């Protein structure tokens, strides 16, 4: 029911570079890595700041904002359970948690 | 672990009230509904809307929109566990859910 290691250091990597972009580059930088990584993973991402807004240039629709109220951190248990659909993993931005984090919908993959 | 059914009927209730409150009078109603419940249950207490903002006159800190992220549904299992603190409960409204929903960290004396 919960992540392997490997598995939560290799998504808390992906809230390091999302920090990475954000700080680089702004909204335009967390706008990329978003589409970057949501068509790596097959999976809906977002960059989020501490008003729980889209930190990119595409501001989140309600339904996507739906999303943020039931998440999971990395080391928690994971389940489809609950809501019947893969979970939603808030990982705090490592160097300034304060200013946002990466939120992905678990990868159908990784699931325990 | 799960909240009695009379209980979360009774918060069910508090959630009608709320969106009564917001449809009779707005930022104003919601601000004045937040405060007297607040200060009944002596808990922290939200209505937000569909973009997770305030629907009352006074916006949510940062701190407050951090509560945001890790709620629980009525019916969900309910435990100070895996953050330490009580949980923070999520009420749609009932008639319009997607105009907003009441948030009321768990009362002390309703933890199963
Ligand atoms: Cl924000
Ligand atoms: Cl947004
Ligand atoms: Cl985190
Ligand atoms: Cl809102
Ligand atoms: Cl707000
Ligand atoms: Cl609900």
Do not use: C, N
């Given at each position: 029911?919960?992540?392997?290691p490997?598995?939560?250091?290799?998504?808390?990597?992906?809230?390091?570079?999302?920090?990475?972009?954000?700080?680089?580059?702004?909204?335009?930088?967390?706008?990329?890595?978003?589409?970057?990584?949501?068509?790596?993973?097959?999976?809906?991402?977002?960059?989020?700041?501490?008003?729980?807004?889209?930190?990119?240039?595409?501001?989140?629709?309600?339904?996507?904002?739906?999303?943020?109220?039931?998440?999971?951190?990395?080391?928690?248990?994971?389940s489809?359970?609950?809501?019947?659909?893969?979970?939603?993993?808030?990982?705090?931005?490592?160097?300034?948690?304060?200013?946002?984090?990466?939120?992905?919908?678990?990868?159908?993959?990784?699931?325990?």
């Amino acid at each position: 029911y919960f992540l392997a290691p490997a598995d939560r250091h290799y998504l808390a990597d992906y809230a390091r570079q999302a920090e990475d972009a954000w700080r680089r580059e702004g909204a335009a930088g967390a706008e990329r890595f978003r589409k970057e990584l949501s068509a790596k993973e097959d999976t809906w991402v977002a960059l989020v700041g501490p008003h729980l807004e889209s930190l990119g240039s595409t501001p989140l629709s309600a339904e996507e904002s739906s999303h943020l109220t039931f998440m999971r951190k990395l080391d928690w248990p994971m389940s489809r359970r609950l809501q019947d659909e893969l979970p939603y993993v808030s990982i705090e931005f490592p160097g300034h948690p304060e200013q946002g984090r990466l939120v992905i919908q678990l990868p159908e993959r990784l699931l325990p």
